């Protein structure tokens, strides 16, 4: 609903992956409104891809 609940969900996911042994990188991760992000050296931005 609001970014506060989104970040609560992100925190819950972080704790869950910690329980499974997966350690998320706080020093190399960031969050932003959906539409622009990266995935395996492939930047996606509102349709454009590089």
């Amino acid at each position: 609903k609001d970014e506060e609940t989104c970040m609560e969900g992100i925190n819950d996911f972080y704790r869950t992956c910690k329980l499974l042994g997966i350690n998320m990188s706080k020093k190399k991760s960031y969050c932003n409104e959906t539409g622009m992000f990266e995935f395996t050296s492939m930047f996606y931005r509102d349709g454009f891809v590089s």
Binding site: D46, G47, F48, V49
Partner: protein, 40 residues
């Protein structure tokens, strides 16, 4: 050999490598259209 070598007979060569010739023929008979960039 490519200059003064014996001249052999190449009849029926297209048949042996028919797939490549078919690819080339398909390419030659192409009808290119427009080019459209990303949606954004």
């Amino acid at each position: 050999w490519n200059t003064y070598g014996p001249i052999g007979d190449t009849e029926g060569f297209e048949r042996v490598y028919e797939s490549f010739f078919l690819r080339k023929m398909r390419l030659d008979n192409a009808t290119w259209g427009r080019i459209t960039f990303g949606p954004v």
